[PDB]
Amino acid sequence: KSLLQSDALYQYILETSVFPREHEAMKELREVTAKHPWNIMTTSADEGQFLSMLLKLINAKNTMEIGVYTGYSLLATALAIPEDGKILAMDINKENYELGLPVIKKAGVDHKIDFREGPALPVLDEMIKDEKNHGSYDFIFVDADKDNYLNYHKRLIDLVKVGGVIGYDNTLWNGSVVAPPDAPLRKYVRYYRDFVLELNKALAVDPRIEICMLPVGDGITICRRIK
């Protein structure tokens, strides 16, 4: 499903504004992923289209992605940034990443990707220690844990430059953020729900960023660093 009022409205957007003129490598990868068990996690085409737009608009060149899976956001990112662009991508799996890596290579853009297998926090902590890494990123996309978002934000805010933009994905969490106390949901969404609400409250109050909650995909909260 989606966050709009009708699956038809959503589709109308896809059929008229996304699928036509959408590279193909995306189409390919989106096809490969459909065969995989956890494909429910791949990000939507409409949202990859928005990310493309945004990347272009802010003319980003150096970026980071936490939560790669298969590679949809990644591919989208690499096809948008300039030829000399660079992306630091982190995921705990890796086998899932290689499942899509063939398509990224087939789009001749895999060279902008530095994949690192393993938990993201450890890495973040080591980067903080080097003052050279501070304010060194144009864009940072966060589509991983959830119970770890606030933790990431603590070091991410010093890694993104003032120019800004950190994207926290899934902030509307399937709407569960307003589900009536009596409408049983999947155990995982019920679990991650407390963290999202908490995450959102913190972001709304954080003086170092500007923020915009866009109901595209499962919701992206765009944060622009102001200090």
In angstroms, the CA 196 to CA 182 distance is 19
CA torsion, ordered 27, 106, 82, 42, to nearest 10 deg = 40
Distance CA 219, CA 137 (A): 22
Q: How far is the CB of 145 from Ca ion (least distance, A)?
A: 10
- Each residue 182-221 as x (binds a second copy by CB under 8 A) or -, in order, gives ------------------xx--xx----xxxxxxx----x
For residue 54, the tally of other CB atoms under 10 A from its CB is 18
CA dihedral 29→111→67→154, nearest 10 degrees, is: -150
User: Applying CB under 8 A, does 12 fall inside the site for a second copy?
Assistant: yes
Q: How far is the CB of 175 from ligand SPF (least distance, A)?
A: 9
Paired strand residues for 195: none
d(CA 196, CA 200): 6
**Residue 127 near residue 156 (C-beta atoms within 8 A):** no
Does the footprint of ligand SAH cover residue 39 (CB under 6 A)?
no
Map residues 130-169 to x or -, x wherever contact with a second copy holds by CB under 8 A.
---------------------------------xxx----
Stretch that binds ligand SAH, among 127-135, 137-145, 159-167, 188-196 (CB under 6 A): 137-145
Confirm if 14 and 45 have CB atoms less than 8 A apart.
yes
Under the binding rule (CB under 8 A), the answer on residue 29 touching a second copy is no
Interface residues with Ca ion (CB under 5 A)? 43, 143, 169-170
Question: Residues 50-89 vs ligand SAH: string with x where CB under 6 A?
Answer: ----------------xxxxx-xxx---------------
Interface residues toward ligand SPF, by CB under 6 A: 1, 40-41, 67, 143-146, 170, 174, 183-184, 192, 218
- Binding residues for a divalent metal cation, by number, are 143, 169-170
